[PDB]
Amino acid sequence: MASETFEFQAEITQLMSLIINTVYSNKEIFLRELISNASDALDKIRYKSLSDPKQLETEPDLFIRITPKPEQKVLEIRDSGIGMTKAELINNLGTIAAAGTKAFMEALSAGADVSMIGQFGVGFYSLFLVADRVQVISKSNDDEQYIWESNAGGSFTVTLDEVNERIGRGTILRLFLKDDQLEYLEEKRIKEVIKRHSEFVAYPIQLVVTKEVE
């Protein structure tokens, strides 16, 4: 319940500020980036399990799941991958990405397409193309479930999770969509973005759709 507050390394702050404010036209690339991250996390729990099969037991099903939450203007991207500990959330989302953000920012200033962001290993931050706030909710086998929260400002919070559904293992990216990016809540649009940029994914991609019965 009591949150802890941390400062972003200056370079990450710089990268986020640029992305949340950019008028780049191909914002849909965020979904490919987050699906790729989900796939990586799943690769890692699968590989870890080769020599430690009990690691799968916390969530035997390996999947990527996409859930639009229209009333809240939220889009969730979930995986049952390896997940992240508290220390991992703090270090990797707040500091380790710093250098990668610098080289990528230099490439941007030179004319690189924002879509290159994954090749510089900082594609997580592409979520700010469509969202002005994010909660990363994560459960590693090695720690409790935690919430990392950022609004692209210079600081982020980490809080022990006593408010969200239990995930057996893995991560939820909960995107709070900008008012002009609500198209990414629609089933039709989501399918077309997946089919276009994520053709070769080794894991099931599940879409959770809410429909009124008549």
Ligand SMILES: COC1=C2C[C@@H](C)C[C@H](OC)[C@H](O)[C@@H](C)/C=C(\C)[C@H](OC(N)=O)[C@@H](OC)/C=C\C=C(/C)C(=O)NC(=CC1=O)C2=O
């Ligand atoms: C190859 O590893 C990747 C790294 C190196 C490093 C951070 C990996 C991380 O180390 C603790 C875990 O091993 C890994 C399993 C966790 C994820 C991929 C998370 O995604 C999900 N769904 O768990 C991702 O998002 C919340 C966290 C950070 C992503 C960043 C900063 C990024 O921008 N791009 C990156 C994409 C990557 O694939 C990246 O830096």
